[PDB]
Coordinates of C-alpha atoms in Angstrom, one line a residue:
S1 CA 144.9 101.1 136.4
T2 CA 146.2 103.3 139.2
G3 CA 149.1 105.6 139.9
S4 CA 150.8 106.8 143.1
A5 CA 153.4 109.6 143.3
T6 CA 155.1 111.4 146.1
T7 CA 154.7 115.1 146.3
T8 CA 157.4 117.2 148.1
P9 CA 157.3 120.7 149.5
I10 CA 159.5 123.1 147.5
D11 CA 160.8 124.9 150.6
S12 CA 160.6 125.0 154.4
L13 CA 157.3 126.9 154.4
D14 CA 155.3 124.5 152.1
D15 CA 154.9 127.2 149.6
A16 CA 154.0 124.6 147.0
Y17 CA 154.5 120.9 146.3
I18 CA 156.3 119.3 143.4
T19 CA 155.6 115.8 142.0
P20 CA 157.8 114.1 139.4
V21 CA 156.1 113.5 136.0
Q22 CA 157.5 111.5 133.1
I23 CA 157.0 113.1 129.7
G24 CA 158.0 111.6 126.3
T25 CA 160.1 108.7 125.1
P26 CA 162.6 108.2 126.5
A27 CA 161.2 109.7 129.6
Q28 CA 162.0 113.3 130.5
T29 CA 161.2 113.7 134.2
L30 CA 160.0 117.2 135.2
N31 CA 158.8 118.3 138.7
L32 CA 155.4 119.8 138.3
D33 CA 153.0 121.6 140.6
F34 CA 149.8 119.7 140.7
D35 CA 147.0 122.3 140.7
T36 CA 143.4 121.4 141.4
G37 CA 142.6 125.1 140.6
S38 CA 143.6 125.0 137.0
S39 CA 143.3 122.8 133.9
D40 CA 146.5 123.2 131.8
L41 CA 149.5 120.9 131.9
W42 CA 152.3 123.2 130.9
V43 CA 156.1 122.9 131.1
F44 CA 159.3 124.8 130.8
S45 CA 160.6 123.7 127.5
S46 CA 163.3 124.0 124.8
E47 CA 161.0 126.8 123.4
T48 CA 160.9 128.9 126.5
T49 CA 162.6 132.3 126.1
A50 CA 166.2 131.6 127.4
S51 CA 166.2 134.7 129.7
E52 CA 163.1 133.4 131.4
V53 CA 164.7 130.0 132.3
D54 CA 166.8 130.0 135.6
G55 CA 167.5 126.4 136.8
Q56 CA 164.3 124.6 135.7
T57 CA 164.4 121.3 134.0
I58 CA 163.0 121.7 130.5
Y59 CA 161.0 119.4 128.2
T60 CA 162.6 119.1 124.7
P61 CA 159.9 117.7 122.4
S62 CA 162.5 117.1 119.6
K63 CA 164.2 114.5 121.8
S64 CA 160.9 112.5 122.3
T65 CA 160.0 109.9 119.7
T66 CA 156.3 110.1 120.8
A67 CA 156.0 113.9 120.7
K68 CA 153.7 115.4 118.0
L69 CA 153.1 119.1 117.4
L70 CA 149.4 119.9 117.9
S71 CA 149.3 122.0 114.8
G72 CA 147.8 125.5 115.3
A73 CA 147.1 125.1 119.0
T74 CA 148.2 127.8 121.4
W75 CA 147.6 128.5 125.1
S76 CA 147.8 131.4 127.5
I77 CA 146.9 131.4 131.2
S78 CA 146.8 133.9 134.0
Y79 CA 146.6 132.8 137.6
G80 CA 145.1 134.3 140.7
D81 CA 148.5 135.5 142.0
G82 CA 149.1 137.6 138.7
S83 CA 151.5 135.1 137.2
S84 CA 151.1 133.9 133.6
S85 CA 152.5 131.7 130.9
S86 CA 151.8 130.9 127.2
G87 CA 153.0 128.9 124.3
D88 CA 152.2 126.1 121.9
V89 CA 151.2 122.5 122.3
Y90 CA 152.5 119.0 121.7
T91 CA 150.9 115.7 122.4
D92 CA 153.0 113.1 124.1
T93 CA 153.0 110.2 126.6
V94 CA 152.7 111.4 130.2
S95 CA 153.1 109.2 133.2
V96 CA 152.5 110.0 136.9
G97 CA 153.4 107.4 139.5
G98 CA 153.1 104.5 137.1
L99 CA 149.9 105.7 135.4
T100 CA 150.4 106.4 131.7
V101 CA 148.3 108.6 129.4
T102 CA 149.1 108.6 125.7
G103 CA 148.2 111.6 123.6
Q104 CA 148.2 114.0 126.5
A105 CA 148.4 117.7 125.6
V106 CA 151.7 119.0 126.9
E107 CA 151.6 122.8 126.7
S108 CA 155.1 124.1 125.9
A109 CA 155.9 127.5 127.3
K110 CA 157.3 130.1 125.1
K111 CA 156.9 132.8 127.8
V112 CA 156.6 132.7 131.5
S113 CA 156.2 135.5 134.0
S114 CA 158.9 136.5 136.5
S115 CA 157.4 134.5 139.4
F116 CA 157.9 131.2 137.4
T117 CA 161.4 132.1 136.3
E118 CA 162.4 133.0 139.9
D119 CA 161.2 129.6 141.2
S120 CA 163.9 127.1 140.0
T121 CA 162.1 124.2 141.7
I122 CA 158.9 124.2 139.6
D123 CA 159.2 122.9 136.0
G124 CA 155.6 123.5 135.2
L125 CA 152.0 122.9 136.3
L126 CA 149.7 119.9 136.0
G127 CA 146.1 121.1 136.2
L128 CA 143.5 118.9 137.9
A129 CA 140.4 121.2 137.8
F130 CA 137.7 120.5 135.2
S131 CA 138.7 120.5 131.5
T132 CA 136.2 123.3 130.8
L133 CA 139.0 125.7 132.1
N134 CA 141.7 124.5 129.8
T135 CA 143.1 127.4 127.8
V136 CA 144.2 125.6 124.6
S137 CA 142.8 127.3 121.4
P138 CA 141.2 126.6 119.1
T139 CA 140.6 123.0 120.3
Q140 CA 140.3 122.8 124.1
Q141 CA 142.3 119.9 125.6
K142 CA 141.6 117.5 128.5
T143 CA 143.5 117.3 131.8
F144 CA 145.7 114.3 132.6
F145 CA 142.9 113.1 135.0
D146 CA 140.2 113.4 132.4
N147 CA 142.3 111.5 129.9
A148 CA 143.2 108.8 132.5
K149 CA 139.7 108.5 134.0
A150 CA 138.2 105.7 131.9
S151 CA 141.3 103.5 132.5
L152 CA 141.3 104.0 136.3
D153 CA 140.0 101.4 138.7
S154 CA 137.8 104.2 140.2
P155 CA 137.4 107.7 138.7
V156 CA 139.1 109.5 141.6
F157 CA 142.3 111.0 142.7
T158 CA 143.4 111.9 146.2
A159 CA 145.6 114.6 147.7
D160 CA 147.5 113.8 150.9
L161 CA 149.7 116.8 151.4
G162 CA 152.3 116.9 154.2
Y163 CA 153.0 119.5 156.7
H164 CA 156.7 120.2 156.3
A165 CA 157.0 116.7 154.9
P166 CA 156.3 114.8 151.7
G167 CA 152.8 113.5 150.9
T168 CA 151.1 111.6 148.1
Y169 CA 148.9 112.0 145.0
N170 CA 147.1 108.8 144.1
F171 CA 145.0 108.2 141.0
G172 CA 142.3 105.5 140.7
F173 CA 142.1 104.3 144.3
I174 CA 141.5 105.4 147.8
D175 CA 144.3 104.3 150.3
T176 CA 142.2 103.3 153.3
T177 CA 145.5 103.3 155.4
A178 CA 146.2 107.0 154.7
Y179 CA 143.4 108.5 156.9
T180 CA 141.7 108.0 160.3
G181 CA 138.0 107.7 160.8
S182 CA 135.7 108.0 157.8
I183 CA 135.6 110.1 154.7
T184 CA 132.8 112.7 154.6
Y185 CA 131.7 113.5 151.1
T186 CA 130.2 116.8 150.0
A187 CA 128.6 118.1 146.8
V188 CA 130.6 119.9 144.1
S189 CA 129.5 122.5 141.7
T190 CA 131.4 122.4 138.4
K191 CA 129.8 125.6 137.1
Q192 CA 133.0 127.7 137.4
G193 CA 135.3 124.7 136.4
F194 CA 136.6 124.3 139.9
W195 CA 136.2 121.7 142.7
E196 CA 133.7 124.1 144.3
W197 CA 132.0 123.1 147.5
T198 CA 130.3 124.6 150.6
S199 CA 131.8 124.3 154.1
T200 CA 129.4 124.1 156.9
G201 CA 131.2 126.5 159.2
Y202 CA 134.2 127.1 161.3
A203 CA 135.7 127.4 164.8
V204 CA 138.7 129.3 166.1
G205 CA 140.8 127.4 168.6
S206 CA 138.8 125.9 171.3
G207 CA 135.8 128.2 170.5
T208 CA 132.3 127.3 169.6
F209 CA 131.6 126.2 166.1
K210 CA 129.8 128.8 164.0
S211 CA 127.4 127.1 161.5
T212 CA 127.6 129.2 158.3
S213 CA 127.8 128.2 154.6
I214 CA 131.2 129.1 153.1
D215 CA 131.4 128.4 149.3
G216 CA 134.9 127.9 148.1
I217 CA 137.3 125.8 146.0
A218 CA 139.7 123.0 146.9
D219 CA 142.9 124.3 145.3
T220 CA 146.2 122.5 145.8
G221 CA 147.9 125.2 143.7
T222 CA 147.2 127.9 146.3
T223 CA 149.4 128.1 149.4
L224 CA 147.1 129.7 151.9
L225 CA 143.5 129.6 153.1
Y226 CA 141.4 132.5 151.8
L227 CA 138.1 133.1 153.6
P228 CA 135.6 135.9 154.1
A229 CA 136.8 138.9 156.0
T230 CA 134.4 138.3 158.9
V231 CA 135.9 134.7 159.5
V232 CA 139.5 135.9 159.1
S233 CA 139.0 138.8 161.5
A234 CA 137.5 136.4 164.1
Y235 CA 140.6 134.2 163.8
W236 CA 143.3 136.9 164.0
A237 CA 141.4 138.7 166.9
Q238 CA 142.5 135.7 169.0
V239 CA 146.2 136.4 168.4
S240 CA 147.7 139.3 170.5
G241 CA 149.3 141.9 168.2
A242 CA 147.9 140.5 164.9
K243 CA 146.9 143.0 162.4
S244 CA 146.1 143.5 158.7
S245 CA 149.0 145.3 157.0
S246 CA 148.2 147.0 153.7
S247 CA 152.0 147.4 153.2
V248 CA 152.7 143.7 153.6
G249 CA 149.5 142.5 151.9
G250 CA 147.6 140.7 154.6
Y251 CA 147.5 139.7 158.2
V252 CA 150.7 139.6 160.1
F253 CA 151.4 138.5 163.7
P254 CA 154.2 138.6 166.2
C255 CA 156.6 135.8 165.6
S256 CA 156.5 135.2 169.4
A257 CA 152.9 134.2 169.2
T258 CA 151.4 130.7 169.6
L259 CA 148.6 130.5 167.0
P260 CA 145.2 128.9 167.7
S261 CA 143.9 126.1 165.5
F262 CA 141.2 126.7 162.9
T263 CA 138.4 124.2 162.3
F264 CA 136.3 124.0 159.1
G265 CA 133.2 122.0 158.6
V266 CA 132.6 119.3 156.0
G267 CA 128.9 118.4 156.4
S268 CA 128.7 117.3 160.1
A269 CA 132.4 116.5 160.2
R270 CA 135.2 118.8 161.2
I271 CA 138.8 119.2 159.9
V272 CA 141.2 120.8 162.4
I273 CA 144.1 122.9 161.1
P274 CA 146.8 123.0 163.8
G275 CA 148.0 126.5 164.7
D276 CA 151.5 125.8 163.4
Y277 CA 150.1 125.2 159.9
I278 CA 149.0 128.9 159.9
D279 CA 152.6 130.2 160.5
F280 CA 154.3 131.3 157.3
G281 CA 157.3 132.8 159.1
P282 CA 159.0 136.2 159.0
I283 CA 157.7 138.6 156.3
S284 CA 161.4 139.3 155.4
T285 CA 164.4 137.6 156.5
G286 CA 165.1 138.3 160.2
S287 CA 161.8 140.2 160.9
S288 CA 159.8 139.6 164.1
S289 CA 156.6 140.0 162.1
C290 CA 155.3 136.8 160.7
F291 CA 152.9 136.2 157.8
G292 CA 149.6 134.5 158.5
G293 CA 148.3 131.5 156.7
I294 CA 144.7 132.5 156.8
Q295 CA 143.9 135.6 154.7
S296 CA 140.9 137.4 153.5
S297 CA 139.4 136.5 150.2
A298 CA 137.6 139.8 149.9
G299 CA 139.8 141.1 147.0
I300 CA 139.7 137.7 145.1
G301 CA 136.0 137.0 144.4
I302 CA 136.2 133.4 145.7
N303 CA 137.1 131.6 148.9
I304 CA 140.0 129.2 148.5
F305 CA 140.8 126.2 150.5
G306 CA 144.5 126.1 149.6
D307 CA 147.3 124.0 151.0
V308 CA 147.0 125.3 154.6
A309 CA 143.5 123.6 154.7
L310 CA 144.0 120.7 152.5
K311 CA 147.3 119.5 154.2
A312 CA 145.2 118.9 157.4
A313 CA 143.1 116.3 155.6
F314 CA 143.1 113.4 153.2
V315 CA 141.1 114.7 150.3
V316 CA 139.2 112.7 147.7
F317 CA 138.5 114.3 144.3
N318 CA 135.7 112.1 143.0
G319 CA 135.4 112.5 139.3
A320 CA 132.3 110.3 138.8
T321 CA 129.5 111.5 136.6
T322 CA 128.3 113.6 139.6
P323 CA 131.6 114.8 141.1
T324 CA 132.0 115.1 144.9
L325 CA 134.8 116.0 147.3
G326 CA 135.7 113.9 150.3
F327 CA 137.6 114.9 153.4
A328 CA 139.0 112.7 156.2
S329 CA 141.2 113.5 159.2
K330 CA 144.6 111.9 159.2

């Protein structure tokens, strides 16, 4: 089997991407944030505290003939941005792009933090990291990918995120029309439950490439590119008037600037992030200070190749017995 679904930016900045997902029978379609940095499939639901729902579409298990309470199971998750959610668990039929899993754990939120409530466009998350990170207790549950894997034509999914445009998540096949050149594969460590890999270095604009190992994660659920302070300082030093602002919470730059590109290494291959991908616009409406898309990881504990990086590539998440990541230009 295979599946193929379009993913759409939630706003003009590409702050996140939403992908329609069918849950239950008859189908209830929710728009979920596919997140390769977490491992829970959770949704706004009929159980979510009413004051914490503001425009989201909800999953109502009582209206699904295939929903079953997963008795005694609870979940609770905290993300890198400080957001959180928790609740109970149903099993139900879940389909993405024509690919169906029966008996998928659908984590129904009873509570969500303010950042979720305030984002009316995101109806929940679909985790695509390793199932070792799933938070369901007392019986950990599998991701949609892990449950689909044995049925897929190839045990892979691909992320093809758009810059200010829709893109695609495919399951079970590699669309050889969707990228240019060849795919470079690189090793993955699953020790922390992430798609963790080591970049071979970076360049700023037309500058020379610096060969250096940068361990980090491929995380579709993170907007920006978070790298070591040395790398980030080297990038922003090439932008007149850029500075790190403790009041704003990262590097800002004059909105009048033209940003340089940023290149990262994948083995001997190179992915180039155009400068415009690094512009996240005014820090507040009407400001002439703009927020940078490359930020320091120093206060995180991990480097994160988020959407800023991943949208410059066609990315293969190879879930074979020995997982690997692949990157191609596009």
